[PDB]
Amino acid sequence: ANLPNQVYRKSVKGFEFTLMVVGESGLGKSTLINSLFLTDLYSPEYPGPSTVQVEQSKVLQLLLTIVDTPWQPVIDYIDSKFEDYLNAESRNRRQMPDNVQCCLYFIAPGHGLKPLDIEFMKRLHEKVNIIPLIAKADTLTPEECQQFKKQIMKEIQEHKIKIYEFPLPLAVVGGRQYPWGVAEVGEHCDFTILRNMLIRTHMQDLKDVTNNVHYENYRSRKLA
Amino acid sequence: ANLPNQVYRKSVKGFEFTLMVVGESGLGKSTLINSLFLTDLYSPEYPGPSTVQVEQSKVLQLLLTIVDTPWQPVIDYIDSKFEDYLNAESRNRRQMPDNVQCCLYFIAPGHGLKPLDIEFMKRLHEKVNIIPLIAKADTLTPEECQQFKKQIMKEIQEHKIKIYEFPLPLAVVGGRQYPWGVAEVGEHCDFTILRNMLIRTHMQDLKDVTNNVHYENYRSRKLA
Amino acid sequence: ANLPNQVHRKSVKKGFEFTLMVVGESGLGKSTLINSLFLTDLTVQIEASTVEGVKLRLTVVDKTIISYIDEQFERYLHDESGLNRRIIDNRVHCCFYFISPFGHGLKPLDVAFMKAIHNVNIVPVIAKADTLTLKERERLKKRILDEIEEHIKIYHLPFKEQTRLLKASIPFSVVGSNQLIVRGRLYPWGVVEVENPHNDFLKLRTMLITHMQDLQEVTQDLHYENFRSERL
Amino acid sequence: ANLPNQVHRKSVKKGFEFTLMVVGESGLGKSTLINSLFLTDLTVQIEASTVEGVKLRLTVVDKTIISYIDEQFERYLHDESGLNRRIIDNRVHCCFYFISPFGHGLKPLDVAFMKAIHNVNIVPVIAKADTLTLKERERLKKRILDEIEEHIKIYHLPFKEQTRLLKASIPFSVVGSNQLIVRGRLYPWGVVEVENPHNDFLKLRTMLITHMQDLQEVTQDLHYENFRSERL
Amino acid sequence: VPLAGHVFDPDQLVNKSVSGFCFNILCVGETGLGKSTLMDTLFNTKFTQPGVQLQSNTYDLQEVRLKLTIVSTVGFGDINKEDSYKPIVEFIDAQFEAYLQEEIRRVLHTYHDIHVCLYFIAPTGKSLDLVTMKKLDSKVNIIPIIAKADAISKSELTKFKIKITSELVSNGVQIYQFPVAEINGTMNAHPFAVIGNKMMPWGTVQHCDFVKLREMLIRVNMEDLREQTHTRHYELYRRCKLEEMG
Amino acid sequence: VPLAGHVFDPDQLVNKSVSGFCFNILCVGETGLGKSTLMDTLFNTKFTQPGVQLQSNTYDLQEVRLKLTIVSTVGFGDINKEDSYKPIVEFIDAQFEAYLQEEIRRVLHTYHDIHVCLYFIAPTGKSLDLVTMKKLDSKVNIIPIIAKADAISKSELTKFKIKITSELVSNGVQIYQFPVAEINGTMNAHPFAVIGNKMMPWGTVQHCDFVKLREMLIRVNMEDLREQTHTRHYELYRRCKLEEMG
Ligand SMILES: Nc1nc2c(ncn2[C@@H]2O[C@H](COP(=O)(O)OP(=O)(O)OP(=O)(O)O)[C@@H](O)[C@H]2O)c(=O)[nH]1
Ligand SMILES: Nc1nc2c(ncn2[C@@H]2O[C@H](COP(=O)(O)OP(=O)(O)OP(=O)(O)O)[C@@H](O)[C@H]2O)c(=O)[nH]1
Ligand SMILES: Nc1nc2c(ncn2[C@@H]2O[C@H](COP(=O)(O)OP(=O)(O)O)[C@@H](O)[C@H]2O)c(=O)[nH]1
Ligand SMILES: Nc1nc2c(ncn2[C@@H]2O[C@H](COP(=O)(O)OP(=O)(O)O)[C@@H](O)[C@H]2O)c(=O)[nH]1
Ligand SMILES: Nc1nc2c(ncn2[C@@H]2O[C@H](COP(=O)(O)OP(=O)(O)O)[C@@H](O)[C@H]2O)c(=O)[nH]1
Ligand SMILES: Nc1nc2c(ncn2[C@@H]2O[C@H](COP(=O)(O)OP(=O)(O)O)[C@@H](O)[C@H]2O)c(=O)[nH]1
């Protein structure tokens, strides 16, 4: 009797992950890229009509892909991600990456749910796991923060979009400080939550279901 | 080594013997029969014209035969003795007696030899052994006895008759005694001589030659 | 009277001859065991060699083989008629046959060897039971024995107990060293002796010397009737 | 190794058989001698009887006889071809032959007996030499021996001196008592012993036990060639 | 590329607690070198006639837990059992989970998906095994093992291990070993060989080459052969077979 | 008759000094029971091949003296020697002195005129002799004698003498004995049997039935058989033969 599967962790040796942002890009997606990641790359978010996607693997190493591009194209980007590699599946095929597709999407005001916020999510629902947050959220009094929380979640319960979960939403403080007072990360910001549950502690599920749901979305679909 | 032949004398158990007298019978043949023999038989010498022959065996036993009969007949008696028994010889014949033929003959005077004394001897010569004696020989002065001794022996040497011998002659005193003197047996008489050499001491030869000479006289004769 | 005395010395000039013919799964020290049964040494091959004294004609397997025995029960019986005689047999004075040490029952191969071989003269045997426990050892003794039983003919062993003892542990399990330390097999776990029980090595050494009178059966039994099948 | 031991006991079950066939001028205590050679007792006749142990088939003369041996070398060799075997021989394991004690040379009768008998197995012998002096005894030993010589075949006797001694006084002169006072013959002139020398009685008693392996010649020699004359 | 930028907050540990967890071992070997006696002795608990027969079990274990098929399987003698039997399981185990996986997915539901064979050879001084192991060169995951270890001296385990190795490569076969790896890498080369109750000839029974096969085989390099097995025999299993349909 | 008259002066003694004096003995017997060894031993001084042979001697002795022929004669074996040989001497000895004695006389010149045979028989427990002795029943003077006397015990000389006598009369034969004769007459019946140097098995050699045959045979009844012999065999010899001419 010696049964360890501490083999299983000696094992990776990698682990790797693709991680999608939509947004209105004035305000702190490219912060949450470099800040969620505690890290500095420049020159990621400026576009022509109409999309911008960096992989890095750094180490401690992940391939952390973020895509972030400023309906159809990120749909038809991401199936054509998705049909690519389970096109690799049918082949003699040697062991090719890469697969996570989930959203980090902003829409961030605030009083209601943002009309293209509405649409972007609805269709996209299947094709990754959607995590939505709320940005520049020193924007809001939180007695006011009460409102965007309730009204959008009511919002999506009504217009009936799926998200992620793992077993709110998540309001994203771009720490950083002002003329009168400084605002922290938090708590303060509920932006630790999106570090804790995003970062290490449910990260596996969102790829595995990313791979599992909408891989088998995309081919159990197109096998028909 | 034990070689005796004192068997040979245990043997006879008889012995037997035939013993012939001629004579002028006045004078003491029948004395010399009974006296030579120291013995008494009567009635032996009286005859008719012309023979008298006794056997006895007495014992101490011989068959002592004397013949005494008063030329041809005593010749033709004695061959017909002699041819009888070697007529027995030729026969299967069982052991028959009897055979001695020798003479005791007297002729007894004395001065010369007695003419029929002469003849009796001459022919008879072969056919027994002849012993001659001289009888009543108290008859003679022996200075005179000298004469009959010499003249007869000369006598027979001349007229050439055979006798016996065994290796004189023999003058036969019929003891007996006279008016003046007695005459003895002897010596005295030379009549012991005729006891000694007659009786025991040459007796065997005279039979054996009697048997041998004139047996083989009588048949070696008549075998021719 | 005496003649057992003057019988006895009489092999003194003459004695004696064994041929035996080994089969068994090579493997398991037929030739290592034999030499130390023998205190000497070495599709078939042949062994003739001699010692203080006796002659060995002794054949190893390395069923072509049933020719060669009846080739030999031929040549026996060729000369026996009979004209002329010095002369020889290579008769199979016995055979051995060797099951495994391990893994249990007795082998279909052993069976149909052991059926059709059997007129000559088997001692079946077990090599290398310093594999085998006495709890294993006895286990194969009998289920061999019964295996004999659904069937058989190896040779039933014609001093009261010296016989009646050897026979009831048939069959007997045996390791030849010819190495030593007292012969003679080497374990750093532990050490393993010849000629003890321990080892049923000597039951066979001492049995098979004792009788050698498959001399006598092989001569009465197996060639008499190889006349009596084969003439007749 | 050992087998002379286990050879030895092996006649223990089985041992052993002698037939011998007596000739000799009756006369001279063939049957009185044999019994005391045997410590037991009795135109030919037959003797089969047994003792602590061994079997006797033993034929006396009382030349018709040369049928009966080759009648027996027949019946040996009838069965040997060979079908079937329990079974028996009456082979002539030896014969004896007996010259006189007295009067000198060896008899024309003995000769032409002893010539034409000779494939089987004689011991010639002398009975009743408490007739005979040692000055007589030796006298017949040799002029017998030479008489053998102008010729012959009786059996030349295949413990160093125990052999080489017995053999040089061949042949040996012998009286059986079975009476006694210590066996066992009675003289008022003097007394006469068995088993001394004295008597060469025991040379034969002890010789003829010793070897009994006309067993072996009669079987090798006389019937082998009675095949080899008679088959061929 | 240069993903090489500079920076606080495991993901590997996450896929640890991907706790459900499965394995197949098959031994093949003659009736009866203790393949079963191997298996209970390995996991310390209890589990001659004609033609090629394979025998089927699976059982389950703890400390945090795992669901494990063991087969062993048996063979004897008069001699092409060995092409036939293991293609029985192994190909056809092995096309199967292809064959789920052509079609609906992913239910995390197999063993013989084949994972290891021990071929156990026996010990002394062979040919049925050579073809058995070269025909079973195919593979499944074949680890190479020597039975009733208390039949040899150590002077012969010197001798018969390191001869029987030449054999592996004489006609050379595929094998297993592992690539870290001093002690993974010592122990592959260290042909291995294998031996009851306590406590603590005349035979007293355990040091012995029992553990070495215990601790690598069962402890250490542990799913490497799981993924070799899904890498290898899924892989020649489909690619040959897709060679053959397509 | 009665020659029986009464009376001084041997004649028997006269024919004693018939001193010249003669005898023949023959023994017949197999080669070689000591017939010669008998003869010198009797008179104490020295004298296997085919057909019947008779051997001839004569010699002379003293103390007062005597001229004595001894023959002995020999025989053996493959069996009508015995009719032939002794008719050789004995008839033809015996007609001879007839044949002088037909013709001239009386020369006192013979032996074999045949006088005695000893037939010597030998000793133990026979047929050649029976016909030999009954054919030689004829006779000459046959005295009946048993050789190498030191071959028997006295318990057997009891036994074999007095059995072998029954034999003499079984087919009964003519014999000798004598008729005086207590001691002549004891000794005839007392089949007799017979044994060297001095002085005074392991054998020391003389009491023994040697003398008895010495002293009667040679001492005592001594010419009885001389005259029996001239009575008997002259007598059947001529009377048969004169039967035959005349
Ligand atoms: N001395 C010794 N005995 C052993 C050894 N290994 C196994 N055995 C014995 O051999 C027997 C093996 O029987 P199993 O355990 O049924 O072997 P198996 O592989 O199941 O055989 P099959 O069922 O026929 O395929 C056991 O009873 C053990 O007692 C060993 O290494 N040394
Ligand atoms: N022990 C013993 N030996 C005897 C006896 N009688 C004779 N012998 C021996 O036997 C031998 C007899 O030989 P011969 O004296 O020549 O006998 P034979 O009658 O002349 O024999 P042939 O000349 O052949 O007719 C002698 O040498 C004696 O030693 C006897 O009574 N006892
Ligand atoms: N006051 C305040 N400013 C922020 C916060 N987050 C981001 N910003 C600023 O607003 C800008 C948002 O643009 P950016 O993060 O680059 O998003 P992009 O347009 O997609 O590149 C950044 O330049 C930040 O300097 C926040 O929480 N509070
Ligand atoms: N004087 C004498 N007388 C004798 C002598 N011899 C015999 N006589 C007698 O003479 C007689 C002779 O006759 P005798 O003898 O009878 O012979 P015979 O005639 O033949 O009978 C006898 O009677 C005698 O008495 C003798 O010597 N002297
Ligand atoms: N421990 C042990 N080893 C054995 C025994 N018998 C044989 N062996 C080993 O097995 C080998 C026998 O090989 P070999 O005699 O050539 O096999 P064979 O040709 O079938 O006789 C030897 O090297 C021994 O080391 C045994 O009883 N005990
Ligand atoms: N003194 C003596 N007598 C013997 C000897 N051998 C035999 N005898 C005698 O001879 C007789 C033998 O007769 P028997 O055995 O019937 O003769 P077979 O039929 O020829 O054997 C016995 O009665 C013995 O008394 C011997 O060596 N010495």
From Swiss-Prot, chains A, B:
Q: List-wise, which residues carry Phosphoserine?
A: 43
What residues of the intact protein does this structure contain?
A: 34 to 315 of 437
- Source domain of life: Eukaryota
Where along this sequence does the record place binding of GTP?
A: 23-30, 51, 136-144, 174, 176
Q: Where is this region: G3 motif?
A: 68-70
- Subunit description: Septins polymerize into heterooligomeric protein complexes that form filaments, and associate with cellular membranes, actin filaments and microtubules. GTPase activity is required for filament formation. Filaments are assembled from asymmetrical heterotrimers, composed of SEPTIN2, SEPTIN6 and SEPTIN7 that associate head-to-head to form a hexameric unit. Within the trimer, directly interacts with SEPTIN6, while interaction with SEPTIN2 seems indirect. In the absence of SEPTIN6, forms homodimers.
Biological process according to GO: cell differentiation; cilium assembly; cytoskeleton-dependent cytokinesis; positive regulation of non-motile cilium assembly; protein localization; regulation of embryonic cell shape; spermatogenesis
What is the name attached to this protein's record?
Answer: Septin-7
Domain Septin-type G intervals: 14-224
| Main location, first listed in the record | cytoplasm
Q: What does this protein do?
A: Filament-forming cytoskeletal GTPase. Required for normal organization of the actin cytoskeleton. Required for normal progress through mitosis. Involved in cytokinesis. Required for normal association of CENPE with the kinetochore. Plays a role in ciliogenesis and collective cell movements. Forms a filamentous structure with SEPTIN12, SEPTIN6, SEPTIN2 and probably SEPTIN4 at the sperm annulus which is required for the structural integrity and motility of the sperm tail during postmeiotic differentiation.
Q: Where is this region: Interaction with SEPTIN12?
A: 14-224
Species per Swiss-Prot/TrEMBL record:
Homo sapiens
The family line of this record is:
Belongs to the TRAFAC class TrmE-Era-EngA-EngB-Septin-like GTPase superfamily. Septin GTPase family.
UniProtKB/Swiss-Prot annotation, chains C, D:
GO CC annotations? actin cytoskeleton; axoneme; cell division site; cell surface; ciliary membrane; cilium; cleavage furrow; cytoplasm
Q: Which domain of life is it from?
A: Eukaryota
| Family that this chain belongs to | Belongs to the TRAFAC class TrmE-Era-EngA-EngB-Septin-like GTPase superfamily. Septin GTPase family.
Record keywords, A-Z: Acetylation, Cell cycle, Cell division, Cell membrane, Cell projection, Centromere, Chromosome, Cilium, Cytoplasm, Cytoskeleton, Differentiation, Flagellum, GTP-binding, Kinetochore, Membrane, Mitosis, Nucleotide-binding, Phosphoprotein, Spermatogenesis
Name of the protein in question: Septin-2
Location relative to the cell: Cytoplasm; Cytoplasm, Cytoskeleton; Cytoplasm, Cytoskeleton, Spindle; Chromosome, Centromere, Kinetochore
Organism source for this protein? Answer: Homo sapiens
Subcellular location, principal = cytoplasm
Swiss-Prot record, chains E, F:
* Stretches for region G3 motif: 72-75
Q: Which GO terms describe its molecular function?
A: GTP binding; GTPase activity; molecular adaptor activity
Q: Per the record, which residues fall in region G4 motif?
A: 147-150
Main location (coarse class): cytoplasm
Q: Does the keyword Transport apply?
A: no
Report domain Septin-type G positions: 20-244
Q: Domain of life here?
A: Eukaryota
As for family, the record states: Belongs to the TRAFAC class TrmE-Era-EngA-EngB-Septin-like GTPase superfamily. Septin GTPase family.
UniProt function note = Filament-forming cytoskeletal GTPase. Required for normal organization of the actin cytoskeleton. Involved in cytokinesis. May play a role in HCV RNA replication. Forms a filamentous structure with SEPTIN12, SEPTIN6, SEPTIN2 and probably SEPTIN4 at the sperm annulus which is required for the structural integrity and motility of the sperm tail during postmeiotic differentiation.
Provide the protein name.
Answer: Septin-6
The coding gene here is: SEPTIN6
Q: Which residues of the full protein are shown?
A: 17 to 307 of 434
